[PDB]
Amino acid sequence: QSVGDSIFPSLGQRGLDVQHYDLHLTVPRPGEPHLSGDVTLTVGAREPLSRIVLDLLGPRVSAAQWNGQRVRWVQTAQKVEVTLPRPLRPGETGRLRLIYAGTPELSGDGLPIRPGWQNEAGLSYSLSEPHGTRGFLPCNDHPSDPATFTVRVTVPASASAAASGLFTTQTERNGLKTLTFTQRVPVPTYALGLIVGPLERRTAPDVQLGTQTVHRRDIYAAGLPAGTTVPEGETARMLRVLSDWFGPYPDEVYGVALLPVRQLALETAGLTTMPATSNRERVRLHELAHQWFGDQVTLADWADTWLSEGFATYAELLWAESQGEDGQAMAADWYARLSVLPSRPLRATREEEIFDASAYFRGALALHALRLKVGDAAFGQFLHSYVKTFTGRPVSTTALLTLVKTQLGAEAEQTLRVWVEGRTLPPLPEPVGAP
Numbered sequence: 460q461s462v463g464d465s466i467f468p469s470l471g472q473r474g475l476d477v478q479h480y481d482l483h484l485t486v487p488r489p490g491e492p493h494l495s496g497d498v499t500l501t502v503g504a505r506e507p508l509s510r511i512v513l514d515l516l517g518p519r520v521s522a523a524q525w526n527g528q529r530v531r532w533v534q535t536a537q538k539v540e541v542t543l544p545r546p547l548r549p550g551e552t553g554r555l556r557l558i559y560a561g562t563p564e565l566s567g568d569g570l571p572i573r574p575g576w577q578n579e580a581g582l583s584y585s586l587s588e589p590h591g592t593r594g595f596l597p598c599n600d601h602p603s604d605p606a607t608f609t610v611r612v613t614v615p616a617s618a619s620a621a622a623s624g625l626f627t628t629q630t631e632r633n634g635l636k637t638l639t640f641t642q643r644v645p646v647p648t649y650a651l652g653l654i655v656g657p658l659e660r661r662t663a664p665d666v667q668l669g670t671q672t673v674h675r676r677d678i679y680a681a682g683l684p685a686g687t688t689v690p691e692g693e694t695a696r697m698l699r700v701l702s703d704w705f706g707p708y709p710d711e712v713y714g715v716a717l718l719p720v721r722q723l724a725l726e727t728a729g730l731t732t733m734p735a736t737s738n739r740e741r742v743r744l745h746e747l748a749h750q751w752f753g754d755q756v757t758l759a760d761w762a763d764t765w766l767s768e769g770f771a772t773y774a775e776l777l778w779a780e781s782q783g784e785d786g787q788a789m790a791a792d793w794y795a796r797l798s799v800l801p802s803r804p805l806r807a808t809r810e811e812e813i814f815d816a817s818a819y820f821r822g823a824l825a826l827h828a829l830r831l832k833v834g835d836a837a838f839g840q841f842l843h844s845y846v847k848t849f850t851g852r853p854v855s856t857t858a859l860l861t862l863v864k865t866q867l868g869a870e871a872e873q874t875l876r877v878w879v880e881g882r883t884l885p886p887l888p889e890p891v892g893a894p
């Protein structure tokens with residue numbers, strides 16, 4: 460029935476393939492949680508579905524339509540359940556439209572944050588990893604089912620808005636502004652950035668990555684601390700370093716939305732949600748790395764968060780070396796940090812664990828061990844192939860190990876496996892060197 464996630468066993472619907480969310484969100488008073496929504500989901504299926512079952516937590520649906528037609532629906536617990544006139548079968552699509560309104564609820568965990576629709580200091584914004592997007596959007600709230608997004612945000616004329624995707628039009632009537640954003644590459648629900656309140660959009664010159672053009676804009680909310688910046692030149696340099704390692708940047712634009720709040724940063728798509736207290740070079744790199752690892756390559760199961768966070772963390776070492784710093788010393792710093800902490804196999808079994816130090820640093824050292832085993836050329840080739848292999852296909856730890864085995868051989872697979880499996884922390888991975 461549900462996606463069957465090992466950590467959050469009730470989220471999502473088995474076999475559902477949401478392909479596009481067309482969301483019109485209306486936020487009457489930014490900074491206060493009440494809101495209203497008009498969303499049309501374009502949905503397909505991997506198995507015959509007699510119902511469409513979406514996650515929703517807080518708001519109440521008041522109307523539903525299927526292909527422009529009246530349809531049976533019920534809202535029960537944390538789900539909206541839509542009974543179809545006939546089964547939705549693979550290869551077909553339909554349009555499910557839902558009208559809803561009310562107060563998004565924050566999930567209260569274990570987790571670093573209470574994810575969902577945040578409200579503070581005149582700002583409302585999504586910070587919804589892992590499973591908070593369902594607070595303000597009826598959705599298949601699981602990273603195994605990424606989708607494209609077109610968002611129209613209606614706000615009072617004194618406010619502005621920013622969502623993931625390129626900004627096109629802003630219209631205004633009766634004291635209300637409506638802004639349209641189009642996210643054209645599919646990302647998990649939690650990677651939908653959406654911020655309303657006092658903010659300004661600021662463009663920077665395009666970045667050229669060979670034949671690929673990446674547009675540049677950052678969001679600056681009002682009231683940022685003195686010195687809250689995106690240093691000139693930095694984002695282009697990080698885009699070059701990381702894309703040279705991972706393959707083409709997956710999106711049409713990149714930037715950060717700087718918020719005067721105190722909170723973790725989140726890799727929302729092409730527009731990282733960046734509270735000022737997290738605004739550091741290494742964090743900016745890390746969140747950009749997640750545009751590949753997490754947003755493009757998405758998780759089959761939340762137990763495997765290390766494939767996002769370990770890879771994003773390892774990107775910080777790749778960045779550090781590109782800036783002339785000693786990568787092995789950084790790996791040693793990761794190890795020293797872990798050597799006084801409990802360790803675990805990389806596949807998490809508890810919600811407490813999915814963003815813990817093992818997911819970030821034990822996962823990063825796993826990739827360090829692999830890299831030192833196969834050499835830098837093979838390792839960079841492997842990362843390119845990894846991103847291509849799990850584009851349009853959610854990744855798992857088993858699938859990674861299979862790819863390493865076939866691409867890099869059984870010895871490379873065993874090197875990664877000792878880091879993946881095993882309750883005790885392995886020794887620090889160190890260069891072979893001459894005999």
Ligand SMILES: N[C@@H](Cc1ccc(O)cc1)C(=O)O
Pocket residue numbers: 571572574586587588589723724725726745746749771814
């Ligand atoms: N994904 C963030 C951490 C985070 C986790 C959950 C959140 O809701 C927000 C942020 C990172 O890259 O470290």
Ligand code: NA
Pocket residue numbers: 476477478604605606
């Ligand atoms: Na999908």
Ligand SMILES: [Zn+2]
Pocket residue numbers: 745749767768771772
């Ligand atoms: Zn991360």
